[PDB]
Design a protein around this motif. Structure first.
Motif, short mmCIF file in Angstrom:
data_model
loop_
_atom_site.label_atom_id
_atom_site.label_comp_id
_atom_site.label_asym_id
_atom_site.label_seq_id
_atom_site.Cartn_x
_atom_site.Cartn_y
_atom_site.Cartn_z
N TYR A 27 4.01 9.49 -15.45
CA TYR A 27 5.15 9.84 -16.30
C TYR A 27 4.92 9.43 -17.75
O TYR A 27 5.24 10.18 -18.67
N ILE A 28 4.39 8.22 -17.96
CA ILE A 28 4.16 7.75 -19.32
C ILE A 28 3.11 8.61 -20.01
O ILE A 28 3.24 8.94 -21.20
N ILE A 29 2.06 8.99 -19.29
CA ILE A 29 1.06 9.88 -19.88
C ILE A 29 1.70 11.19 -20.32
O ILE A 29 1.47 11.67 -21.44
N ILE B 53 3.98 2.49 -8.95
CA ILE B 53 3.31 2.20 -10.21
C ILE B 53 2.54 3.42 -10.70
O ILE B 53 2.54 3.74 -11.90
N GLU B 54 1.88 4.14 -9.79
CA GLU B 54 1.12 5.31 -10.20
C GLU B 54 2.03 6.42 -10.71
O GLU B 54 1.68 7.13 -11.67
N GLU C 129 0.80 -1.22 0.00
CA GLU C 129 0.00 0.00 0.00
C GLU C 129 0.83 1.28 0.00
O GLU C 129 0.36 2.31 -0.48
N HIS C 130 2.05 1.24 0.53
CA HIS C 130 2.86 2.44 0.67
C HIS C 130 4.10 2.48 -0.20
O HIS C 130 4.69 3.55 -0.35
N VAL C 131 4.52 1.35 -0.77
CA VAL C 131 5.77 1.27 -1.53
C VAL C 131 5.51 0.95 -3.00
O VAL C 131 6.10 1.57 -3.89
#
Lengths: 250, 206, 49, 250, 206
Positions: free
Chosen positions: C37-39, C31-32, C24-26
């Motif tokens: 960045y890809i967007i 990933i988000e 949940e924290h790492v």
């Protein structure tokens, strides 16, 4: 040896005719003087940069990343000057050498080169940073003329099955190692530790060779069998029984 | 004598590099060493230490001549050189000599004309080659070659040219390569047999 | 027997909560970040064409 | 004071000459009448956006996120009009004010500003949500002219060491604070709790100040030493020994 | 009289806003107060209970004039507003009157011209600035300002204009700030010494 040298202090627009004088000599020697030629073309990326530089000065409708829209038809007139012809005892083997920008294999140059050549040998950076030579990553490497050059009467009857099983084992071991590093060093099953030992010994004993070491094919196959003997013979599903019976118990 | 800044000064032969370029840093000397006649790039964001590394290298290295090109950077970073260097000294024959007696600066700061950022680079690498021909070992610090690339993009935009990648001209890599191909150890043109060298250390500002 | 159960259950609870907090924290924030960045980078490739 | 007010319902293309009028006035007052000027330029983001609009109006080459390719060379003609000169008893201290879109420091405006100016003062949102004033996050902050302005005969002999040690301790405390969000409150050591105490006392005693409080720099250094005495003098591995012998016991 | 919608109307002075905007709800009046001359934003989404704001503003409020704006709403979402609004009532001097005696509506749908779905916000704010100059206290409401920003982006796209972050035009924040800078309390131009106000409530759909 015949050398054609265009250094980085030389004019850029010469790189357009350089791979074509090197491939016109190789065609005279092979198909008129009947010898076996090996053509090396170093930095097929500089050639494409010179292509883009000439296309940008002509104000043409650009391709992807700015490279000309006819770069496929242009690289194909270089790569396709290789092979044997009927009635003449000469051949031409080609080994171009790219450098992918940002280690990206979907850049226009590697992409278009893959559509034209028969495979590729992939030099990896992760294996380099861990002192492995030659750092060849066999998972995205390919040779499309292998199936018809190996086997019984050419190299040895167990070549294709050993190669297939080594590839499958390496893939399964990478997919294990991922979540082993992620979720749980002890949640690993009893056989999810055999794939990791295979990973280590395969990258240290099969791949890693030595910059002056000349192995035969049969030594390579013997090392492959020594590595496949890590697994019980029930886990080698990509090898037939007739071959396992003859080569596994040693 | 007078020499065109875009033509490479000739030599007799280019030799391989066999001696270290000693900076004063523990890292960069133990782990990633440069040599006398090599080529280096220091990429980093802002506030990382490209200028401090460059100025320490130019103060404490083992080179005989130092050329410092400030190409499109702060104007208070050339006043720190013209103030610090006349105070630092080095020992030779018992006598102490300031390290400004062997340094030359070429400054074109960030509010100076943009087209003279190119002429700056070529002005430095042509002074590195004039002293190397005497038999010295020169080091050339090019601070933010990215400003040279930005000047090239600006001029190419005023000409209505077709960009290549992120706006830059299609011949950027050729310029960069033919500029970095002027560094090396050489057997010097001329009858008395000398041996010289030119190292280049280029900062990049992504 | 109840106390033995108690102890093993108490340690397994901690292990599972550690795993939940890690995912949940790492992992999900990373990933988000590499999705945003890809967007951005695709939006930047479009503006050059 | 001399004000140059261009508001939000005013011409956009006249935001391009407002800072230059301000700076011409400043240079006249400083380098000809020999005063000490302080220039405050508010929302260089609106200047940069008017600049982008004029650039897009006449179809010039863009940079990142559409901003013109000459935005560095344009901001540098504004920021570089600040300093001292030889023979004149004036100066110009510039303090632009920015607003980073989406709190992102990699946006073209803060990123190109940080390559030109001699430091930056970072105002944080995470500290504002805890009702802390001034909400200054010292890790992404910097001043490039500090090393030459502090020390013996300028402020005090120990300024630099206290500063570097506070930086190191603050960074390690923020590391521990994120480790405990995964491993829990009761898996930390005896020193991690020292760091978590330093973090709280630092954020509440050193940073937090009150909006009309004028702390002389010696008061600041005394507060810094009172914060550094949380640790035994062997954890302070950036301060030389002859400074700890004189300033740590008191 | 005729007035261009993209020009602010002149005032004598822009005063600071220091009086509440009474809505009638205990929340929004105790915990999150708005002033006469302020700027509010709500989330315009489905099933969020959004009509309370506009109905409270229209029926029970200290405003004198109400101006409602739809900036490109769906076809059947406009048919609900144009049905409900002529039904609301107020009580004044003991009698019961219709809110459409002090209300004006600007109504667009998704298929009406794209240059009317963009200039709607300006028509509304000009009407409210016209009624503020009489001495009244107006409260404008712009429903789905996002549907206005999209018509802005499309008008840009038509003119083949360089995109900005997420394709929206370069001048998006300039427009959104010069719009909300038209609200507030003012001292009106003209002799009989009055004072008026305009309160803007925008709605966004993230």
């Amino acid at each position: 040896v015949c050398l054609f040298l265009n250094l980085a202090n030389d004019p850029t627009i010469e790189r357009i005719i350089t791979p074509r004088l090197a491939l016109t000599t190789a065609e005279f020697l092979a198909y008129q003087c009947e010898k076996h030629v090996l053509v090396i073309l170093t930095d097929m990326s500089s050639y494409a940069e010179a292509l883009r530089e000439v296309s940008a000065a002509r104000e043409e409708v650009p391709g992807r990343r700015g490279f000309p829209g006819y770069m496929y038809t242009d690289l194909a007139t270089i790569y396709e000057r290789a092979g044997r012809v009927e009635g003449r005892n000469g051949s031409i083997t080609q080994i171009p050498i790219l450098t992918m920008p940002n280690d990206d294999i979907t850049h226009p140059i590697p992409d278009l080169t893959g559509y034209i050549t028969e495979g590729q040998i992939y030099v990896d950076r992760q294996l380099h940073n861990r002192q492995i030579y030659p750092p060849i990553n066999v998972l995205p490497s390919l040779s499309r003329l292998m199936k018809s050059a190996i086997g019984e009467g050419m190299t040895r009857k167990d070549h294709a099955d050993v190669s297939n099983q080594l590839y499958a084992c390496y893939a399964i071991g990478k997919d294990v190692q991922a979540m082993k590093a992620v979720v749980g060093e002890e949640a690993l099953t009893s056989d999810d530790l055999l794939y990791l030992e295979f990973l280590q010994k395969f990258e240290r004993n099969f791949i890693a060779q030595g910059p002056y070491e000349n192995r035969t094919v049969f030594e390579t196959l013997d090392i492959g069998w020594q590595l496949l003997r890590i697994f019980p013979k029930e886990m080698l599903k990509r090898i037939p029984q007739s071959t396992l019976s003859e080569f596994y118990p040693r | 004598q007078v020499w065109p800044v875009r033509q490479v000064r000739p030599v007799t032969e280019k030799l391989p590099a066999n001696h270290p370029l000693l900076t004063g840093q523990r890292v960069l000397d133990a782990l990633f060493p440069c040599v006398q006649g090599g080529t280096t790039a220091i990429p980093g964001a802002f506030g990382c230490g490209k200028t401090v590394i460059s100025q320490s290298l130019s103060k404490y290295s083992n080179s005989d001549v130092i050329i410092y090109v400030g190409c499109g950077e702060r104007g208070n970073e050339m006043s720190e050189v013209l103030r610090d260097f006349p105070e630092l000294t080095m020992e030779v024959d018992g006598k102490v000599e300031s390290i400004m007696k062997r340094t030359a600066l070429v400054a074109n700061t960030s509010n100076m004309p943009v087209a003279a950022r190119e002429a700056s680079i070529y002005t430095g690498i042509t002074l590195s080659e004039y002293f190397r021909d005497m038999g010295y070992h020169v080091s050339m610090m090019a601070d933010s070659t990215s400003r040279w690339a930005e000047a090239l993009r600006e001029i190419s935009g005023r000409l209505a040219e077709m960009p290549a990648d992120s706006g830059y001209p299609a011949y950027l890599g050729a310029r960069l390569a033919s500029f970095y191909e002027r560094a090396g150890r050489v057997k010097c043109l001329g009858n008395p047999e000398r041996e010289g060298s030119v190292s280049i250390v280029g900062a990049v500002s992504p | 027997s109840l106390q033995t159960s108690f102890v093993t259950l108490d340690e397994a609870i901690k292990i599972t909560n550690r795993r939940v907090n890690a995912i949940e924290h790492v992992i999900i924030p990373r990933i988000e970040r590499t999705l945003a960045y890809i967007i951005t980078e695709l939006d930047e490739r479009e503006r050059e064409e």
